[PDB]
Amino acid sequence: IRGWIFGTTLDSKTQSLLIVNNATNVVIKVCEFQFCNDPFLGVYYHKNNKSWMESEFRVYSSANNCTFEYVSQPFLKNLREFVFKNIDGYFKIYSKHTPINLVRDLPQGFSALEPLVDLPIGINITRFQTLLALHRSYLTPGDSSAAYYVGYLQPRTFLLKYNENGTITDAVDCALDPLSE
Amino acid sequence: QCVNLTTAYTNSFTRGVYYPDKVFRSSVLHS
C-alpha cells in the first residue's frame, strides 16, 4: 500500500487529492486528475541488486489545474493505521505504527492514533481508492502468475482516559451498550 | 497509460481512536 485517491468523480472534471508514498518522501497533490479505473504503482525485482524497485506510475493518464502540493517524510506482522477526515476545509490524517502477531484479524487492545498532518486542501470528497504496488509478474498477458481494512467514522461521544504522560490508554464508546453509557 | 486489471468483515474491537485535538491533558478522563 503506497497511497490513496480522495475525490468525487475521480476524473478530470473535478479536483482530487492524491497521496503517494515512495522510497524517499510523500507527495500530496490536488489537481484535476484523470485517474485510471485500476490505478497502481509498478514495482519490479531488480535481479542484480536483488531488491524491489519502482518502475512507472499508472495512477492517472493526465493532471492539470493543480492548486496544492506538499512534500514530507514517508510513512508507508506490521500494522499501519490511518484516519481520514475532511472538516472545515482541512483534510486531517492521523496515524499509528504498531508491530503485531496476528494474521487474519485486527489486534485487540487500545492504541490512539496521533495527528500526522493537517492539510489545507478545501475540496469535496465522497469516494476514495487505495493505491497498491503491483509486482511486475502480475502484468503478464496470461491469466496466471495486498490486504487492508476499511471502516467508517460516526458522530459518537467518547470518554478518553489520559495517563500521567498524556497518552490515551483507554476509551469508552458511550453508545456501545448500557454499561458504557 | 492505464491498465485494465479488474477481473469479508473483521471486528474493529476498540481501535480507530485518535487524539481529538492538540491539547495536552494528563491523569484525566475527558469526554
Partner: antibody, heavy 117, light 106 residues
Framework: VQLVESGGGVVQPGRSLRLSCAAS????????MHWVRQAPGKGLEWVTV????????YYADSVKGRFTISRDNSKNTLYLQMDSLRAEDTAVYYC????????????WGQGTLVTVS | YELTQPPSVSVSPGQTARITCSGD??????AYWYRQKPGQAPVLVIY???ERPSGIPERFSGSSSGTTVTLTISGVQAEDEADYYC???????????FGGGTKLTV
C-alpha cells in the same frame, strides 16, 4: 499446441489487410498472444500483444494507431487488423503464445508473409 | 529498453561460441535467447538468463553480469549455424524487445 497463421498477401500502400491465427491443443482463453514480424534480411520485431481476456492490448510505436489486435475466445482465433499499410511493413508475421507466468514466447506459428507495394 | 548484440560471431566446429547482448534493461530484468534457422520460427534456447527448456541440450548455457548477458554454446556443430536473438521486456509489461540478432558462423 499448434498455431496456424493465414490471411497474408500482397497489397498496395494505404490499403488494409487482416491476418488470422487459429489456435489448437490448448486452452486459448487462458493465454495471452503476440504478433512478431520479421522483414527479409532483418531481425525479429515485436508488433503487438493481447491479454488472455482481451482486457489489455499494447502495440509497438512503429505500428501504433494503425494496427488493431483482437481475439475471439469462442473460435480459438487471434486476429490482427492492419490498416494504412506502408512499404516498410513488408515482413513475415508470426503469431506466438505468451508463456504463462513469464515474459517470453514459448510456442510459435509458422508465419505468413505480408508484402506492401 | 534497447538490446544491443553483435551482427555475427565466427566459431570453428568444436569450439565454444559466446554471443553477448547488452543494455540497461538487462541489469534489471531477465534475458531470453532464441535460435532461428532459415525458413523456421524462432525457438527458445535459454530463459531467465541461464535455464534451458527440455528440448535444449546441455551444450547451451547462459550467464549475466551487470548490463551484459551471454549465451554460451560449447562443442559448436554445423547444426548450430543459426541466427540467435536476445529478448526482454519493459518494467510495466507494455513492450517487448528483441536485439538485432547475431549470425553464428560455424
Amino acid at each position: 499446441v499448434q498455431l496456424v497463421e493465414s490471411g497474408g498477401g500482397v497489397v498496395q500502400p494505404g490499403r488494409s489487410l487482416r491476418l488470422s491465427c487459429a489456435a489448437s491443443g490448448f486452452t486459448f482463453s487462458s493465454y495471452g498472444m503476440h504478433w512478431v514480424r520479421q522483414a527479409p534480411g532483418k531481425g525479429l520485431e515485436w508488433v503487438t500483444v493481447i491479454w488472455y481476456d482481451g482486457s489489455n492490448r499494447y502495440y509497438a510505436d512503429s505500428v501504433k494507431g494503425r494496427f488493431t489486435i483482437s481475439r475471439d475466445n469462442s473460435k480459438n482465433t487471434l486476429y490482427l487488423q492492419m490498416d494504412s499499410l506502408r512499404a516498410e511493413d513488408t515482413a513475415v508475421y508470426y503469431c506466438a503464445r505468451a508463456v504463462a507466468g513469464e515474459w517470453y514466447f514459448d510456442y510459435w506459428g509458422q508465419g505468413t508473409l505480408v508484402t506492401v507495394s | 529498453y534497447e538490446l544491443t548484440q553483435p551482427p555475427s560471431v565466427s566459431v570453428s566446429p568444436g569450439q565454444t561460441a559466446r554471443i553477448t547482448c547488452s543494455g540497461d534493461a538487462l541489469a534489471k530484468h531477465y534475458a531470453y535467447w532464441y535460435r532461428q534457422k532459415p525458413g523456421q520460427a524462432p525457438v527458445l534456447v535459454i530463459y531467465k538468463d541461464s535455464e534451458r527448456p527440455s528440448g535444449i541440450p546441455e551444450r547451451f548455457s547462459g550467464s549475466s553480469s551487470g548490463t551484459t548477458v551471454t549465451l554460451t554454446i560449447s562443442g559448436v556443430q554445423a547444426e548450430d549455424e543459426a541466427d540467435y536473438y536476445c529478448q526482454s521486456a519493459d518494467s510495466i509489461g507494455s513492450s517487448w524487445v528483441f536485439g538485432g540478432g547475431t549470425k553464428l558462423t560455424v
